[PDB]
Amino acid sequence: SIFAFTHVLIPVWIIHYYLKYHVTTKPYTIVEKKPRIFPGDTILETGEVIPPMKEFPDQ
Amino acid sequence: NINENNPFLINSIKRLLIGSLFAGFIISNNIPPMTIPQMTMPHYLKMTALTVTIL
Amino acid sequence: MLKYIIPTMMLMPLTWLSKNSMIWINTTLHSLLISLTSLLLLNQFGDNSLNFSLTFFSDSLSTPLLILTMWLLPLMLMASQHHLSKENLARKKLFISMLILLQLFLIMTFTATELIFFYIMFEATLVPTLIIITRWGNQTERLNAGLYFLFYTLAGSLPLLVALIYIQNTMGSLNFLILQYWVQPMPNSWSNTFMWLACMMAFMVKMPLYGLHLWLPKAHVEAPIAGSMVLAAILLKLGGYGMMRITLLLNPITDFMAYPFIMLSLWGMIMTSSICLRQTDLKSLIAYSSVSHMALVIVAILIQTPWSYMGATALMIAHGLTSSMLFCLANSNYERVHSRTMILARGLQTLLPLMAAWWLLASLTNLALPPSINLIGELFVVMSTFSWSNITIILMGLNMVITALYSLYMLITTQRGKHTHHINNILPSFTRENALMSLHMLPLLLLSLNPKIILGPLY
Amino acid sequence: FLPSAAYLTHQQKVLQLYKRALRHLESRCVHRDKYRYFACLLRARFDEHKNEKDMVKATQLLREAEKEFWHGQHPQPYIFPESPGGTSYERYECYKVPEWCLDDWHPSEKAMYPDYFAKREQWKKLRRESWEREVKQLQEETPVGGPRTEALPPARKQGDLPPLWWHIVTRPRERP
Amino acid sequence: MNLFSSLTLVTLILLTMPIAAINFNTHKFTNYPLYVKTTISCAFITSMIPTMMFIHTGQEMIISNWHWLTIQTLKLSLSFKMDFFSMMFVPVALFVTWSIMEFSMWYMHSD
Amino acid sequence: SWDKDVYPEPPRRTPAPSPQTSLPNPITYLTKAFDLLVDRPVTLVREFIERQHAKNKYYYYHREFRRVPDITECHEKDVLCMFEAEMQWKRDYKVDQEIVNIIQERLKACQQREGESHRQNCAKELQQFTQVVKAYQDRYHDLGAHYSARKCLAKQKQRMLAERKATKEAA
Amino acid sequence: FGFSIVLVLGSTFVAYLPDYRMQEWARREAERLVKYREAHGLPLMESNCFDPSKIQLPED
Amino acid sequence: GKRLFIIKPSGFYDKRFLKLLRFYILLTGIPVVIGITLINVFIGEAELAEIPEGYVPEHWEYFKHPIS
Amino acid sequence: SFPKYEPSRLASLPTTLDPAEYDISSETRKAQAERLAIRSRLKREYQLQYNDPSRRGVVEDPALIRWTCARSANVYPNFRPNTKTSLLGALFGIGPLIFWYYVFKTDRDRKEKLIQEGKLDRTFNISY
Amino acid sequence: DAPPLTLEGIKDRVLYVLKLYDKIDPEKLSVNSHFMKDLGLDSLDQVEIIMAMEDEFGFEIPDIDAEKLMCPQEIVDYIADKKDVYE
Amino acid sequence: SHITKDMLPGPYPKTPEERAAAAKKYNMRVEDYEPYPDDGMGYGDYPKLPDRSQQERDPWYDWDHPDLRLNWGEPMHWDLDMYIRNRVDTSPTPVNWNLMCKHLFGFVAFMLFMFWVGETYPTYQPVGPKQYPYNNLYLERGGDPNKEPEPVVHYEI
Amino acid sequence: GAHLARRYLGDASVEPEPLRMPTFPPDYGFPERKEREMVATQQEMNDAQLVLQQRDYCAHYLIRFLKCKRDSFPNFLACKHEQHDWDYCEHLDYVKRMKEFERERRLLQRKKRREQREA
C-alpha cells in the first residue's frame, strides 16, 4: 500500500513538522477554544475542584 | 437499451441512499444544541406539516 | 544605476557589430543578463529612498516599474519577429537598436531626480515610438495615428515645461527631496489654479483621461506588437508614475479644484467599458480596457490616501503585464489569419489547443481573478474611494460587472463554439508563442505569491 | 426561402401547418392514445373541406387556420434532442475536427499510423486528379450566365466524380 | 493539541496532489480518474475523525500563519477556523462529491 | 521563545474526561497510534537537526538606533537637520503602526479564547484598544498622503489650539 | 537563460532578502517598547507626539 | 472491428513545449531546492542575542537566514 | 379566435400571420425569383472558391470587410452637426456628468458639515 | 450509450413499421416501391408516415427534405445519411 | 489588393446613381436597398434591414456559417453584433408583449403590496417576554462593569 | 388563533399590544408572592461557555445534560431523560409566559370595561 503510505504519512509528517516548531515560534498562532467545565468537574492540570451545583427542586 | 449492470453506479446510489436514510438522524441526533427549541406547540401547528403534505 | 545605464549603451552597438543570423541570440542573451542585474537593484529599505550619482534615486514607486521595463525589454525583443524576418538586414538592425534607445530614455525617465530632466526624458520616450509605429504599422491609417499621437502628447505636455520652470525660479531647485522638505502650501488664487491645471492637464493627456482618449486606440490598433506593448504598458504607466511624483506640491488647493476630473473619470470609465462591449476588431478591446484601468488610476491619484497609492501602483504594474500579454495573443491570432477583424476567426478551442489555456489565464487576470494583483489594485482603489465618499461604489461595481462582461465576451466569441471550416491555413502553435505566454504569466503569479515588494512608498 | 424552389407553394404551406399542429398536439397531450384520438379529430377537421378547389376560400381557411393554431399552441414544444433548440443540438461539435487538417502533424506521429495516411494520400490524389477539367467545364458550360438555382448536375457526361464534392463527402461522423 | 490541527491541514493538502500529478504527468494516465476518486475517499475518511473529536469534546480552534501585505494598521494572513459550521459542513460535501466522482466515471466514461 | 509579559497567556484550564462509557473510546486508540506513528520520528529528525544546529552557531542583533533631537529644534529650511528629524519621526510612525497591530492581535486572541461568551472577560483589552486608537485617530490620522513630519505638527498645533479655546470657553 | 537562471534565481532572490521596508525590525522594536510601556506604568501610545511644552501658540 | 479513427487536432508541439518547460525548470529547480535545504538545515539559522558591551557589528549579523 | 398578436420592438411577427404573404402580386414573385438568383450566384462563387485544393488562406469575404469599414471609420464622413445630432450629443455627454457632479458635491458637503459638527462616528476610522 | 446501426437491420425496421401501419397492403409492398404513385394513399397520410419514422428513430427530419422520400429505399438513404450508417 | 470603391462614402442621393450603385455593390434588389435616410448621425449609405434576423432564418436551409446564420454575401446588418444567437432572442413569444409585461408588473406589485400589509400586521402567539433574571442579562450585555446595576427582576406568577 | 383575529378585526383595545407586556403594575394580583429560585449559580453559568439567549431559566438541567453528553459521547442514545426534563421545564416556562399574557389580557378586559362602563 505505497499509495496509503504516501497520502497519509508524508504530508502528515511534513505538516506536523510544520505545526510544532516554526508555527509555534510564531507567537499568536493557532488558538484553541476552551473546553467547558462543569460544577461536577475537577481539573486535569494541577488538580483543584469546583463545588457542585446546588439544590434541584420543583421538578 | 435499458442497462444498469454497473458496479460503479450501484455503489454510488447504494451509499447515497444509505446516507439519505440514516445519516440525517446521525447528524440531527448529536448536534451541539446552539439554540433554544420551542417544542410547545398547539394543535394544528405541529400537525400542519403532515396535513399540508397529505392534502 | 549608472551600472544599469552604461551596459544598455554598450548593448546598442551589439546588433551593429554582429553579423547576420547571429544578432538574435546575442540581443536575447545579453538583454536577459541585463534583466538579472536589473533585479539586483532591490536594496530599498525603511527610512529613505536610495539616492546617488546626484541625478539618481530610487523609491518603490520606481523600483518595480524600472524592473518592469528592464524585464519587458527582452520579452519584446523576442516577441517582434515573424513580421520583419523577411525584411532587410539594415531595417532589422535599425528596428532593434531603436527599441534599445527607447529603453535607455525610459530608464532615464524613471530615475529622474530633477523634473526638467524628467520632462526631457519624457518626450525622449515619445520620439522613437512614433518612428516605430509609423514605419512598421502594417495598416493604412498608421500615418494619421502617429500624427494624432505626437500632437496630443506634445501639446498637452508642453505648458508643463513652463510651469516647472516657473517653479524652478520662484522657489529654488527641483530635487524631489528639496521639492519635498521645503514645499510651502500654496493658496487658492487663480494663478495657483492655472498652475495646478497645467500640470494635471498635461498628465491627464498622457494617461489619457476620458475626454482626450481617442489619442490611444488608433495608435494601439495600427502599431507593431513591440510599439503596442511598450506604448500601452510602459508609456501609460509612466504617465501615472510622473503624476505620483508631481502631486507632492499644490496639496491644499487640489481638494477644492480637483472635483470635476473625478466625475469625468468615473463616467468615462463606465462609457469606456460600455464602448468595448460591442466593437469588432479584437485589437481595440484591449486598448479600451487600458483606458478603463487608467481612469480608475486617475481616481486613485486624485484621492490622496496611502491605500489609494498602494492600489494605484499595483494596478499600474498588473495591468501593464496583463494588457501587454493580451496584445501578444491578439498578434498571434492575427498572424494566424491576416484579418484584424474578430468574427472571422471563430473556433480555436479545437485547433491550437493549449492556446486556450493562455486565453483563459490572461482573460481571468483581466477579470480580477480572486488572488490576482489586478484584483488587489482594484479592491484597494474601491476601499479608498468609498472612504472618499459613500456613494461612489455603484460606479465601481458597475465597472466590475461590465469589465467581467466584455472579458467573457472576448473569451467566448473569439475562441468558442465553431471553427468556420473555410480557413485551412492555421498551423499548430509554435514554441515561441508558448514561450511568450510563459514569460508573461510567470511573474504575475510569482507576484501573486509575495506582493509586498511592489506596493507604494506609502507602505 | 429554400434551396431549389424560389418560394414555397400553398400545398406545401398547408402541409407544414399540418406537421406543426400535429407536433404540438404531441407535446400537449400525454398518454399517447388520447393523443391518437385528438390527432384523428384534427385529421377529421382537415377532412371536412378537403375536396374544395376555391383557392381564395382555401387561403381564407388557411388564414383562419393560422389563427386557430396560434391561439392554442404549446409553450415548450417537444423537440427532439438533435433538433434546433434541442437537448444536444450538435453536442459533440466539440469533437468535430475538420479534415483539411490532420496533415499538420509530425512525421514520427505520421509514421505511427501508416495505412490510413497512405489511403489518405490516394484520396488526395483522387481529389487533385479530377478537380480541374471535368468539374470546372461542367460548371462553366452547362449553367446559364445567371445560374437561377443551386442544385448542381451530376457528372453524367463520362467518368469521374460529380462536381464540388470535397467538403460535402468529407464531413465528420456526428458521433465520434 | 497537535492531532486536530494536523489532520485538518492534511485534509486540505490531500486536495492538492492530483493537480501536481497532471503537472508532473507528461503521459496519458488511463487511471487518473481512479487516482482522484481514491484520494477523495482518503480525504473523507481522514476528515470524519476530527469532526468526531469536535462532538466528543470540542477544542474548537483557529489556525493562521503566513502573513502577507501587512501594510497599514491591519494584517492579513492565511487564516481559517474550525468551529460548528466549518466543522460539520465539510464531510457532507466530501461524501457527496465522492459519489459524484463515481457517477462521473460512469456517465462521462466515453469522452 | 517569546515574551509572555507582552503576549499575555491567561491561566490554563483543562478538565479530565471521566467515562462512564463502554463502547469504548475511539480517540484513545487514535491518539496512541498518532503519537507512536507521527510524534516520535518527527522528533527524532528534529533532534538530528538541532544537533546540526549545535555543531556551529550564529548570532543576529537588533539594529538599535540613537535619538536625534527634534523637529521643533530645526530652523526655517536647514535640510540636514530636518532629514534626521523626519527619518526619526518616520521610524516612530512605523513602530507605532506595529503597536496598533499588536493590540489588534491581542483582541483577536481574547475573542477566540472566550469562544461563545464574548461580552465578558474581554473588557480590559477592548478598553485599552479604544484608548490606543483614540490616540492614533487624534494624532496621525487625517494627514493624507505626503506626510513629511510637518503636516503632523500643523495638526498638532491645530488640535491643541482647538482644545485651548475649548477650555477658555468652558473655563 | 530566461527561466533556469533568471526566473528561478529571481524567485530565490526576492524570496528572502532583508526586512523589506524595515519589517521585522519594527516587530521586535514594537515588542520591546510595548513590554516597556506596560511594565513601567506609563500609558501605551501617549497622544501629543510632540510635547506641548515646546510650543508657542498664537494668542488673542 | 469496433475501434475507429478519432481525428485529433495535434499533440506533438504541445507536449514538446510542456516537456521542455518542465525539464528546464527542473534543471535548476531541483539543485536550487536542494541547495536551500542543505543551507538552512546544515548551517542553522541564527541566534537572537543582544548587542554585547563595547562591540560594533557590521551591516550583516542582522538577518536570520544565512544566505540573507 | 385570437387577439391578433400585435408585434413590438422585440416580439417579432412570425411568417404565418403577415398577412402580406397572401396578396401575392407580380413583383413579389419577380422579387423572390431575382432574390434566389442573387443567392444562387453568391453560393456559386463561394463554392467555387471554397472547394479549390490550391486554396491556402481564408476565402476572403468582401462583405464582412465592407461592414467593418462601415462601422469603424466611415462614421465620420459623412457627418454634419444637425439639430438632432448636437442636441443628443450635449444630452448624452454633459448630462450624466453634471448629474454625478451634483450628487458628489451633495455627499461631500454633507460629510464636511457633519465632521465640522464634531460628532462624526470616528470611534475608530483609521484606514481613511 | 452504445446503439449499433447497420444497413439491412434498419431496412428491416423501416419496412417493419411500414408493414405494421394498417391501411397499406402487405402484399405489394416492395423495398423500392412508391407511396403516391402505386399504393395510392395521399399526401397527408404520407406525412403521418414521416411522423412515424421521426417518432421512432429520435430526430426530426425537415420540411425541406419531407417532400421527397416517396419510397422506403430513399427513406433508408436519408436516414443513413443522418446517422452515417456505414462501417 | 482591394478597390477603394467597394467601400461606401456619401449618402444615397440621387435616385439613379446611388440606387443602381448600391444594388450592384450590396448584391440586393434595387428598390429593397433602403438607406436610413440621412438622419445626420453618420451611418453612411448602408442599408436598413428588418433587424430581427437570427432566431428567424430556419436552421434547415443549410447555408455556410452554421451558427452565425450567414450566406457569405449579404448586406451584413448594421447592428449584427447586438443580434447573434446568444445575445437577443427576438423569437415570437407565445402570448403578446403588452400582456406579458402587464401580468409581470401586476404580480410583482401585488406581492410587494401584500408584503407591506404584512409588515404593518405581524404575528404573535400568546407569549410573554423571555424573562431574563439578572437585570435583563446585565453584566453579560455590552458592558457597564460596576457603573449602574439597575434593579429589575421577575416575579413568580 | 382567534385572539389574533379579534385584535385585527374587532377592537384594538382588549388585546394588549405585544412586546410592551407589563402595563399593569406587579404585586397587584400577586400580593406577596415571588420566590424566583434561579439556582443556576451565575458564576458557574458564566464560567460555563453557554451562549447568550441560553443563559436562561432551568439552565442547571442543561448543565446536567452537557455533563452526561460530555461524559458519554459514543453512547449514541444514552442521554435522553435529562434533556427530556429540560424540555419539560421549558414547557413550564412557556406556560408561565402564557399565564402572564392572559393575566394582562384579563386585567385589561375586566378592569377597563368596569371602568368605562361605570364612567
Short mmCIF file of N, CA, C and O in Angstrom, two decimals, chain I residues 23-90:
data_model
loop_
_atom_site.label_atom_id
_atom_site.label_comp_id
_atom_site.label_asym_id
_atom_site.label_seq_id
_atom_site.Cartn_x
_atom_site.Cartn_y
_atom_site.Cartn_z
N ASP I 23 -51.68 38.31 -50.44
CA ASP I 23 -51.99 39.08 -51.64
C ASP I 23 -50.74 39.18 -52.53
O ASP I 23 -50.17 40.25 -52.75
N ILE I 24 -50.35 38.03 -53.05
CA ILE I 24 -49.13 37.93 -53.85
C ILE I 24 -49.37 38.59 -55.20
O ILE I 24 -50.31 38.25 -55.92
N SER I 25 -48.53 39.56 -55.53
CA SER I 25 -48.60 40.27 -56.78
C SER I 25 -47.52 39.75 -57.73
O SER I 25 -46.85 38.76 -57.45
N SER I 26 -47.35 40.44 -58.85
CA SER I 26 -46.36 40.02 -59.83
C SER I 26 -44.95 40.31 -59.35
O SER I 26 -44.07 39.45 -59.42
N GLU I 27 -44.72 41.53 -58.86
CA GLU I 27 -43.37 41.91 -58.45
C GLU I 27 -42.92 41.20 -57.19
O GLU I 27 -41.72 41.12 -56.95
N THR I 28 -43.84 40.64 -56.41
CA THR I 28 -43.45 39.79 -55.29
C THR I 28 -42.74 38.53 -55.77
O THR I 28 -41.64 38.20 -55.31
N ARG I 29 -43.35 37.81 -56.72
CA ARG I 29 -42.70 36.61 -57.22
C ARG I 29 -41.51 36.94 -58.10
O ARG I 29 -40.55 36.17 -58.13
N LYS I 30 -41.55 38.08 -58.78
CA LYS I 30 -40.37 38.53 -59.52
C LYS I 30 -39.22 38.84 -58.56
O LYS I 30 -38.06 38.51 -58.85
N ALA I 31 -39.54 39.42 -57.40
CA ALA I 31 -38.52 39.72 -56.41
C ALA I 31 -37.97 38.46 -55.78
O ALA I 31 -36.76 38.37 -55.53
N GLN I 32 -38.82 37.47 -55.53
CA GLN I 32 -38.33 36.21 -54.99
C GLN I 32 -37.49 35.47 -56.02
O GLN I 32 -36.48 34.84 -55.66
N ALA I 33 -37.84 35.57 -57.30
CA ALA I 33 -37.03 34.96 -58.35
C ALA I 33 -35.66 35.61 -58.45
O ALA I 33 -34.64 34.92 -58.49
N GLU I 34 -35.61 36.95 -58.45
CA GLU I 34 -34.32 37.61 -58.52
C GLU I 34 -33.52 37.44 -57.23
O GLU I 34 -32.29 37.38 -57.28
N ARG I 35 -34.20 37.31 -56.10
CA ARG I 35 -33.51 37.09 -54.84
C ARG I 35 -32.87 35.71 -54.79
O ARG I 35 -31.74 35.55 -54.30
N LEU I 36 -33.56 34.71 -55.34
CA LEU I 36 -32.94 33.40 -55.47
C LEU I 36 -31.80 33.43 -56.48
O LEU I 36 -30.82 32.71 -56.30
N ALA I 37 -31.91 34.26 -57.52
CA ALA I 37 -30.80 34.40 -58.46
C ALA I 37 -29.56 34.99 -57.78
O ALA I 37 -28.43 34.54 -58.04
N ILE I 38 -29.77 35.96 -56.89
CA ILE I 38 -28.65 36.56 -56.16
C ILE I 38 -28.00 35.54 -55.24
O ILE I 38 -26.77 35.38 -55.24
N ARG I 39 -28.82 34.83 -54.44
CA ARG I 39 -28.27 33.82 -53.54
C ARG I 39 -27.62 32.68 -54.31
O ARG I 39 -26.61 32.13 -53.86
N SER I 40 -28.13 32.38 -55.50
CA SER I 40 -27.56 31.33 -56.33
C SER I 40 -26.18 31.72 -56.83
O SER I 40 -25.24 30.92 -56.75
N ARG I 41 -26.03 32.95 -57.32
CA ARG I 41 -24.73 33.36 -57.85
C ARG I 41 -23.70 33.50 -56.73
O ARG I 41 -22.52 33.15 -56.92
N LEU I 42 -24.14 33.96 -55.56
CA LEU I 42 -23.19 34.10 -54.47
C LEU I 42 -22.75 32.76 -53.92
O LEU I 42 -21.56 32.56 -53.65
N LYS I 43 -23.67 31.80 -53.80
CA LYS I 43 -23.22 30.47 -53.41
C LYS I 43 -22.42 29.80 -54.50
O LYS I 43 -21.56 28.97 -54.19
N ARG I 44 -22.64 30.15 -55.77
CA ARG I 44 -21.84 29.54 -56.83
C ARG I 44 -20.40 29.99 -56.75
O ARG I 44 -19.49 29.16 -56.75
N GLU I 45 -20.17 31.30 -56.64
CA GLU I 45 -18.79 31.76 -56.49
C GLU I 45 -18.19 31.35 -55.16
O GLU I 45 -16.98 31.10 -55.08
N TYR I 46 -19.02 31.22 -54.12
CA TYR I 46 -18.50 30.74 -52.85
C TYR I 46 -18.03 29.30 -52.94
O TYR I 46 -16.94 28.97 -52.48
N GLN I 47 -18.86 28.43 -53.51
CA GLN I 47 -18.48 27.03 -53.60
C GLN I 47 -17.36 26.81 -54.60
O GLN I 47 -16.62 25.84 -54.47
N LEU I 48 -17.19 27.71 -55.57
CA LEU I 48 -16.02 27.66 -56.43
C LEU I 48 -14.75 28.00 -55.66
O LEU I 48 -13.74 27.32 -55.80
N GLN I 49 -14.79 29.06 -54.86
CA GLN I 49 -13.60 29.44 -54.12
C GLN I 49 -13.49 28.73 -52.78
O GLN I 49 -12.62 29.05 -51.98
N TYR I 50 -14.36 27.75 -52.54
CA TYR I 50 -14.39 27.00 -51.31
C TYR I 50 -13.90 25.58 -51.46
O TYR I 50 -13.41 25.00 -50.49
N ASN I 51 -13.98 25.01 -52.65
CA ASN I 51 -13.55 23.64 -52.88
C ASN I 51 -12.23 23.54 -53.63
O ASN I 51 -11.85 22.44 -54.03
N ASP I 52 -11.53 24.65 -53.84
CA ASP I 52 -10.26 24.62 -54.55
C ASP I 52 -9.19 23.97 -53.69
O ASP I 52 -8.99 24.38 -52.55
N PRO I 53 -8.47 22.97 -54.21
CA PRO I 53 -7.38 22.40 -53.42
C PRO I 53 -6.15 23.27 -53.39
O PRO I 53 -5.30 23.08 -52.51
N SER I 54 -6.01 24.22 -54.31
CA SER I 54 -4.87 25.13 -54.27
C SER I 54 -5.07 26.27 -53.28
O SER I 54 -4.15 27.07 -53.09
N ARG I 55 -6.23 26.34 -52.64
CA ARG I 55 -6.59 27.47 -51.80
C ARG I 55 -5.88 27.36 -50.47
O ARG I 55 -5.94 26.32 -49.81
N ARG I 56 -5.19 28.43 -50.08
CA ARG I 56 -4.35 28.41 -48.89
C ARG I 56 -4.95 29.24 -47.76
O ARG I 56 -5.22 28.71 -46.68
N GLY I 57 -5.16 30.53 -47.99
CA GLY I 57 -5.65 31.41 -46.96
C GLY I 57 -7.14 31.25 -46.70
O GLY I 57 -7.74 30.21 -46.95
N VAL I 58 -7.73 32.31 -46.17
CA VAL I 58 -9.18 32.35 -45.98
C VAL I 58 -9.84 32.61 -47.33
O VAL I 58 -9.16 32.94 -48.31
N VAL I 59 -11.16 32.47 -47.38
CA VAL I 59 -11.88 32.69 -48.64
C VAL I 59 -12.08 34.17 -48.93
O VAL I 59 -12.61 34.51 -50.00
N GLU I 60 -11.65 35.05 -48.02
CA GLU I 60 -11.50 36.49 -48.22
C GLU I 60 -12.85 37.16 -48.51
O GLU I 60 -13.11 37.69 -49.59
N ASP I 61 -13.71 37.11 -47.50
CA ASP I 61 -15.10 37.51 -47.58
C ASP I 61 -15.24 39.03 -47.69
O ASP I 61 -14.94 39.74 -46.72
N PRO I 62 -15.73 39.57 -48.81
CA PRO I 62 -15.70 41.02 -49.01
C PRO I 62 -16.75 41.77 -48.21
O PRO I 62 -16.55 42.94 -47.86
N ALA I 63 -17.87 41.13 -47.91
CA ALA I 63 -18.97 41.84 -47.27
C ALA I 63 -18.69 42.11 -45.80
O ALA I 63 -19.08 43.16 -45.28
N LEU I 64 -17.98 41.21 -45.13
CA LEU I 64 -17.57 41.44 -43.75
C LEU I 64 -16.55 42.56 -43.67
O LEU I 64 -16.61 43.40 -42.75
N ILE I 65 -15.62 42.61 -44.62
CA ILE I 65 -14.67 43.71 -44.73
C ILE I 65 -15.39 45.03 -44.95
O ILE I 65 -15.06 46.05 -44.33
N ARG I 66 -16.39 45.01 -45.81
CA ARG I 66 -17.15 46.21 -46.14
C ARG I 66 -17.90 46.73 -44.93
O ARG I 66 -17.87 47.93 -44.63
N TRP I 67 -18.54 45.83 -44.19
CA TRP I 67 -19.25 46.23 -42.99
C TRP I 67 -18.30 46.70 -41.89
O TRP I 67 -18.65 47.59 -41.12
N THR I 68 -17.09 46.13 -41.83
CA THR I 68 -16.11 46.59 -40.85
C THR I 68 -15.68 48.02 -41.15
O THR I 68 -15.63 48.87 -40.25
N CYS I 69 -15.39 48.31 -42.42
CA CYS I 69 -15.04 49.68 -42.78
C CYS I 69 -16.23 50.62 -42.63
O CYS I 69 -16.05 51.82 -42.43
N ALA I 70 -17.45 50.08 -42.69
CA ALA I 70 -18.62 50.92 -42.47
C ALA I 70 -18.76 51.31 -41.01
O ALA I 70 -18.91 52.48 -40.68
N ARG I 71 -18.74 50.32 -40.12
CA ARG I 71 -18.99 50.57 -38.71
C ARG I 71 -17.82 51.25 -38.04
O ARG I 71 -18.01 51.95 -37.03
N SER I 72 -16.61 51.08 -38.55
CA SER I 72 -15.44 51.58 -37.82
C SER I 72 -15.17 53.05 -38.10
O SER I 72 -15.35 53.90 -37.22
N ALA I 73 -14.77 53.37 -39.31
CA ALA I 73 -14.18 54.67 -39.58
C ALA I 73 -14.83 55.42 -40.73
O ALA I 73 -14.33 56.48 -41.11
N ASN I 74 -15.90 54.89 -41.31
CA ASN I 74 -16.70 55.65 -42.25
C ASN I 74 -17.90 56.27 -41.55
O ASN I 74 -18.88 56.63 -42.21
N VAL I 75 -17.84 56.37 -40.23
CA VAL I 75 -18.86 57.09 -39.49
C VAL I 75 -18.74 58.58 -39.76
O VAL I 75 -19.73 59.27 -40.01
N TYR I 76 -17.53 59.07 -39.76
CA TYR I 76 -17.30 60.49 -39.60
C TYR I 76 -17.42 61.26 -40.92
O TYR I 76 -18.04 62.33 -40.91
N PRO I 77 -16.89 60.80 -42.06
CA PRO I 77 -17.58 61.15 -43.30
C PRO I 77 -18.57 60.05 -43.66
O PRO I 77 -18.17 58.89 -43.75
N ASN I 78 -19.84 60.37 -43.87
CA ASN I 78 -20.37 61.71 -43.72
C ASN I 78 -20.89 62.01 -42.32
O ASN I 78 -21.31 61.12 -41.60
N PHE I 79 -20.85 63.29 -41.97
CA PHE I 79 -21.49 63.81 -40.77
C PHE I 79 -21.58 65.32 -40.86
O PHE I 79 -20.56 65.99 -41.06
N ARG I 80 -22.78 65.84 -40.69
CA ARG I 80 -22.95 67.24 -40.41
C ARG I 80 -23.63 67.41 -39.06
O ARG I 80 -24.53 66.64 -38.71
N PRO I 81 -23.16 68.33 -38.25
CA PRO I 81 -23.82 68.55 -36.96
C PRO I 81 -25.16 69.24 -37.11
O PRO I 81 -25.23 70.45 -37.35
N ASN I 82 -26.23 68.48 -36.97
CA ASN I 82 -27.57 69.00 -37.13
C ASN I 82 -28.16 69.36 -35.78
O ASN I 82 -27.47 69.39 -34.76
N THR I 83 -29.46 69.65 -35.77
CA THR I 83 -30.17 69.89 -34.52
C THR I 83 -30.25 68.62 -33.69
O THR I 83 -29.95 68.62 -32.49
N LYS I 84 -30.61 67.51 -34.35
CA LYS I 84 -30.79 66.24 -33.66
C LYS I 84 -29.48 65.71 -33.12
O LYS I 84 -29.39 65.31 -31.95
N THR I 85 -28.44 65.74 -33.96
CA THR I 85 -27.14 65.21 -33.59
C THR I 85 -26.52 66.00 -32.44
O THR I 85 -26.06 65.42 -31.45
N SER I 86 -26.56 67.33 -32.53
CA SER I 86 -25.95 68.16 -31.50
C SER I 86 -26.73 68.10 -30.20
O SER I 86 -26.13 68.08 -29.12
N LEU I 87 -28.06 68.07 -30.28
CA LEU I 87 -28.85 68.06 -29.05
C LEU I 87 -28.69 66.74 -28.33
O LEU I 87 -28.50 66.71 -27.10
N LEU I 88 -28.71 65.63 -29.07
CA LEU I 88 -28.49 64.34 -28.45
C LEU I 88 -27.06 64.19 -27.96
O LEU I 88 -26.82 63.51 -26.95
N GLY I 89 -26.11 64.88 -28.60
CA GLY I 89 -24.74 64.84 -28.11
C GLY I 89 -24.56 65.56 -26.79
O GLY I 89 -24.01 65.00 -25.84
N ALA I 90 -25.03 66.81 -26.72
CA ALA I 90 -24.94 67.57 -25.48
C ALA I 90 -25.79 66.97 -24.37
O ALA I 90 -25.52 67.23 -23.20
#
